Amino acid sequence: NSLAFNHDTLPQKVMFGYGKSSAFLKQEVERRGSAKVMVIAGEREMSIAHKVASEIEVAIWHDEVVMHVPIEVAERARAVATDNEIDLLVCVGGGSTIGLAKAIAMTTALPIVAIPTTYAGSEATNVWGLTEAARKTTGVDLKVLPETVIYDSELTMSLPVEMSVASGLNGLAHCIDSLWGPNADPINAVLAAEGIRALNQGLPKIVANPHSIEGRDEALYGAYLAAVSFASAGSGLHHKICHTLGGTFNLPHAQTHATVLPYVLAFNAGDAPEAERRAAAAFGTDTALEGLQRLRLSVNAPKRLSDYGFEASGIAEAVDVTLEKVPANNPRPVTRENLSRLLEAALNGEDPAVLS
Amino acid sequence: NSLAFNHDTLPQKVMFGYGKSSAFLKQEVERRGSAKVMVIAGEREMSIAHKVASEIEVAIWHDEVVMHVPIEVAERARAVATDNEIDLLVCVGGGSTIGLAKAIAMTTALPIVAIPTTYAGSEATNVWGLTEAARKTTGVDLKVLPETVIYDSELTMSLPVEMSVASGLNGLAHCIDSLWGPNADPINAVLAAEGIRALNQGLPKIVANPHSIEGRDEALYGAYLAAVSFASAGSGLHHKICHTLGGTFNLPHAQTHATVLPYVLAFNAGDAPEAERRAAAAFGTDTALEGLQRLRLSVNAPKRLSDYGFEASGIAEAVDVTLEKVPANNPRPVTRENLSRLLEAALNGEDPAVLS
């Protein structure tokens, strides 16, 4: 067997710099010639957005940003964009905010400039998500990928240490799960490793100093590369487990990713030796699980799903819904029984080494 | 002085696999619905181009491929494209073949599927070149970036070892110069280092066995990442020198790049510590230069520009033409004297360490 892969590199501009968001946005809106800019920021994020968009003229400030992007919310937002003749969408915030921008792009094909404030990386994917009648639906479309991403670490400094850490490990999970993702390839693999390197350097710095320019820059850069890698490599076992835990059991997104990650690594590591070594090298340790555990310890990462309401009684259904979602090419064959044992370890915070 | 950059990730699909070019081309043409394909290949690659396009219908076979892409040759190719209502360009061959496809796309906006047979990496850049009125210039245009690249190392099995080595070192130069390029950033940096790793591994395996699938795949993969890095980082000192030597003195392309590289590395290394350490790590050696020198010895690399007819009497002019083209941000300040000394070293193949 010789090297074989099919890789898609997605078009995107990335403007990166502490304190430069308002100046970058001005430059981008000038470069584009946009006449009617729509700023999307959650009601609680909206004062920051005003400061970020201070150097441009804004036609509409839209603050109905809602988790899981309900279709009626997306419908109202499309109407505002359409009724106001908007020609540029600008989103300032996290996944739900970027998610609303995406939902508008789906039907309007309006371009998006994303100005993210967390490490979830939705700005780097062509994946959209909608909820309608308690049913979440997703898809892929180049129209939903932001054309430009403006990363300004100053905008992430008010994110509390615990949430910053949780969110950073969500980004780290985009990197690690992608190393054995359904469409893993050498390119998305190098980018995932670089993401691990950056997040591993940045997150301890954030814990020690939440206004660390160096550390917040490393984390935000790392989150970017994590997401770009994930958009190419596709969702692996980790993301399928978390999809279920969030979708069926409504557990908190970031903390769930944070908690599930080390168990999936331990579960798959033995059967994905090349991924394991690359991750190891990115952490600067002999093994990847050692790298992750040390980081988790230094960062006081989440340890148990039971701390977010998940019970042992919910593992049967958890396994039941996820099992079919798992990629056929997951390094280690997944079974109802070994997926149940993984969730038991993540539920109660056992040593992940137990799943090796 | 915190991290700041503006990075353009260019859209591209890359399909990779020994023996798969004809099946990939079929897939690509069918996915596009293309009805009037034009295959571009020099006479010496036409037999091979016919085999590569054996699973598709080809409207036009065009073999007028000429080094430096004369404007008259570009103009004839564009007319064939337009007269025949061509809807897809497919190029099979090296730099000059890909160069002609690019020249056609400049005016027609036709998409290009590139099927490369060397390591020059033109298939991964948005750089075009034309020669008009005895003057060669290059420019940038997104329309010239091939939308898809098909890498099939079977098509490189017959590439002679000397050309393979010289062209591979051309690819290596794309990586190394990009490390201190005018728009060097952390992303093109990590890609450049991945290119160094792949080429350093691959080229010696090709010299050891010209039909090594492992080595041929590594070189081709390396060449891709080198060029993607370079498309982003822009032309640094090395490329400016080589452009002058190829344009004004008509020195052979791959050999000139191969020969000049160690001298530009030796010259800039001390003033680019972060770049030097990254290259060193990629080579797996203590310094970047010893890594490059070990590679060069192991592949019997080109040694001196005098082997291609360059003479000392031409250095003053080379320097004249190049000095003003050097990026203001080159690591070591470039003077008329030290650029002359650099070219004297390359002329006679002196120990590159003479420039450290």
XYZ file of C-alpha atoms in Angstrom, chain A residues 315-324 336 339:
12
model
C -25.137 4.893 29.028
C -27.293 2.220 27.321
C -29.169 4.803 25.203
C -25.966 6.855 24.716
C -24.239 3.827 23.227
C -27.371 2.809 21.305
C -27.687 6.111 19.368
C -23.918 6.643 18.794
C -22.825 3.168 17.717
C -24.238 3.599 14.159
C -21.837 -1.754 22.219
C -18.339 1.931 23.914
